[PDB]
């Protein structure tokens, strides 16, 4: 770490607090989060999980019994460039364009068999020339609180969830991007939860076949009935609501593939726009 010089503080979750720093050899400017041998091994592994909208994990460094990633810097996250945004919404051309680019970098994620777990606008990444990426893949997994992109399945205290928990998760920025206000900004694990169930309709097993014998699924949970979307996410057109619709289907099993996301008729005219971006 005496290589490296800490410029500011960018970030605080789970693992650790995140530092833009300088690399006083190269003098690079990097991304340095500060956090077991099998987590040795899948972080090491992440180190060759390398794809243009997923922030490059440039070194993992295991000095004096600490554990320090060094990532690629990126100018901004999603939630400051919304925040920026929210008087005037980001056009929907951009919007399009950053949906695109998540479900290629979640396709190649997933088809490495590696999962976010935990995708939310802070751990997006942009930069000037349109890109966006996603950081943090794989840690969750590898070293064994938000909850507003949570996936249902979660909430319901499945174990053994799978690769649709980021299609939820990406669904629900989605939505958040297009009209400017969190889907399900629930405050508690029940308020998710029945937040969720009040607009997409409380579960049952014709929509979502062994729902009723989840961990924590109770019978005494209220009945909500499900809403229209077109009522959740105007003024999004039919392509951008059916979409929506896919990555928020209760059954896992159900929730579109990222693959089959990136053949949907609402990516037929898809561009790379340029951001504005105040940095
Ligand atoms: C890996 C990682 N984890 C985080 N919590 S931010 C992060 C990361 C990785 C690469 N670039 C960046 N840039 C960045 C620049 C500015 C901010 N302002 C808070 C807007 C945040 C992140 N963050």
Redesign the pocket.
């Given at each position: 770490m005496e290589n490296f010089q800490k410029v500011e503080k960018?970030?605080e979750?789970t693992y650790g607090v995140?530092y833009?720093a300088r690399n006083k050899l190269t003098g690079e400017v990097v991304?340095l989060?500060k956090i077991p041998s099998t987590a040795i091994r899948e972080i090491s592994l992440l180190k060759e999980l390398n794809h243009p909208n997923i922030?490059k994990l440039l070194d993992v460094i295991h000095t004096e019994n600490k554990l320090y990633l060094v990532?690629?810097?990126?100018?901004?996250?999603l939630k400051?460039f919304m925040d920026a945004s929210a008087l005037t919404g980001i056009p929907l051309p951009l919007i399009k364009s950053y949906l695109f680019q998540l479900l290629q970098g979640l396709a190649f994620c997933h088809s490495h068999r590696v999962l976010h777990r935990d995708l939310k606008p802070?751990?997006l990444?942009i930069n000037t020339e349109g890109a966006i990426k996603l950081?943090?893949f794989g840690l969750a997994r590898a070293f064994g609180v938000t909850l507003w992109y949570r996936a249902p399945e979660i909430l319901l205290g499945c174990k053994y969830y799978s690769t649709a928990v980021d299609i939820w998760s990406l669904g629900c920025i989605f939505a958040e991007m297009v009209t400017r206000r969190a889907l399900f900004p629930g405050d508690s694990e029940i308020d998710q939860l029945f937040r969720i169930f009040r607009t997409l309709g409380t579960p049952d097993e014709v929509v979502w076949p062994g729902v009723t014998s989840m961990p924590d699924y109770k019978p005494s949970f209220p009945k909500w009935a499900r809403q229209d979307f077109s009522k959740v996410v105007p003024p999004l057109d039919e392509d951008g609501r059916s979409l929506l619709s896919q990555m928020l289907h209760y059954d896992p099993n159900k929730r579109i593939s990222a693959k089959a996301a990136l053949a949907h008729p609402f990516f037929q005219d898809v561009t790379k726009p340029v951001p504005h971006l105040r940095l």
């Open positions: 960018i970030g979750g995140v833009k991304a989060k922030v990532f690629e810097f990126l100018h901004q996250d400051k802070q751990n990444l950081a943090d």
